[PDB]
């Protein structure tokens, strides 16, 4: 079960391969590669991105509220007189 000699029992399968020296290292990396990457990105965009956008909104508001708190209070001095 841990040696290539005996791992599983398969039947009726064929495989075809070519030598590394008989083929290009970057085949269709301009017409077929980029579109596949775009498919990958698009297929998982809405599953991740939006949550991290919420994080950014929480981060900005926080900082804004923190600084907003340190501003002096005109309502604590109107009557101080």
């Amino acid at each position: 079960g841990r040696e290539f000699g005996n791992l599983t029992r398969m039947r009726h399968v064929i495989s075809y391969s070519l030598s590394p020296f008989e083929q290009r290292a970057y085949p269709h990396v301009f017409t077929k590669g980029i579109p596949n990457v775009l498919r990958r990105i698009r297929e998982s965009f809405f599953r991740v991105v939006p949550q991290f956008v919420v994080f950014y909104l929480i981060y900005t508001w926080g900082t804004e509220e923190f600084e907003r708190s340190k501003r002096k209070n005109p309502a604590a001095y109107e009557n101080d007189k």
């Binding site: 841990r2 791992l7 599983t8 599953r47 949550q51 994080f55 929480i58 981060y59 923190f66 708190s69």
Partner: protein, 379 residues
Amino acid sequence: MTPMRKTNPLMKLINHSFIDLPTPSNISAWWNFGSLLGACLILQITTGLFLAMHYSPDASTAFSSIAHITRDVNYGWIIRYLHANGASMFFICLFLHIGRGLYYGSFLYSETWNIGIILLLATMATAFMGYVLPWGQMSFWGATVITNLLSAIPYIGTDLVQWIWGGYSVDSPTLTRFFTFHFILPFIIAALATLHLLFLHETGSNNPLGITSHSDKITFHPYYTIKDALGLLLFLLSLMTLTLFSPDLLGDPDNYTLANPLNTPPHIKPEWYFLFAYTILRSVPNKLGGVLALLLSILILAMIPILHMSKQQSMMFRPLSQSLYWLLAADLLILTWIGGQPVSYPFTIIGQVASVLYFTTILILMPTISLIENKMLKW
């Protein structure tokens, strides 16, 4: 006439682990960090060994020793920065190494998963005692706070703190023992790592799909050697860029001022990799509550395998679980960010909400949605 790597005992082990190891062919980059972790360890070890030849583990000369390394020792500054920056890289890979298992369901390998928890705790201890060695303001006070956290024990309390300190406060004796412990633990982690790999080989690696890969296994020597040799090159690229262009970015000033037992800086925030737990502590007013929270945090990782309810390993085929996963990650980012900010109204409330959300998501939401997905699949 037969190959000589199948007779010599020392070559049998190398052949099993490295050359003729059956490995799934579709494993992605996520499976590379494992190797990188060991590589980073091997780097740290050597880098630290060279720093030990010029470091004086004494409270009155440790700080001056480092200043001498960076100004008089040939290429001492680069060695020091490589050690410091290489520690952050360790944690980054370690967090990504743990996230992969959480996502793809590698925790089902009980033995291997449990060994990892131990490895994590051992590495966390190593990094904490290393950070106190420089004897800067942050180093001195960070140890004080973290060491005073054992006073919450019901009846023993002070005894452990005074025992660890070797006195009534933090001073030279504490520094010396920490230096020795810092030196030794990494070698203990190496032994644990071998046990980690040991239990792993019995079953093999898990593919991203989660289905049995016994039909598409390939050898490791020609394919994953170069693939893991490309990852290490990228790892070095990132590390060298950090060291050679922004030597002090993931650190914090006040480590370049001599430690003062009397003066105390205001923020006194710990290291970035020990920030999420720090916020969890501050979220609970009670000391005993906070320490239990910290521990309960790590313990969740051990309980995660028990909380699994879906009939699939990978979340690749379970989008609702994926969305929850990413929300949990964002929550961890918020925890880290809060840890870096002073104690104030908005941060405190946000930290409490993040902490409760963290725990609830893991302990409640994940099992429930897993059952829901089993229902929509008519399992």
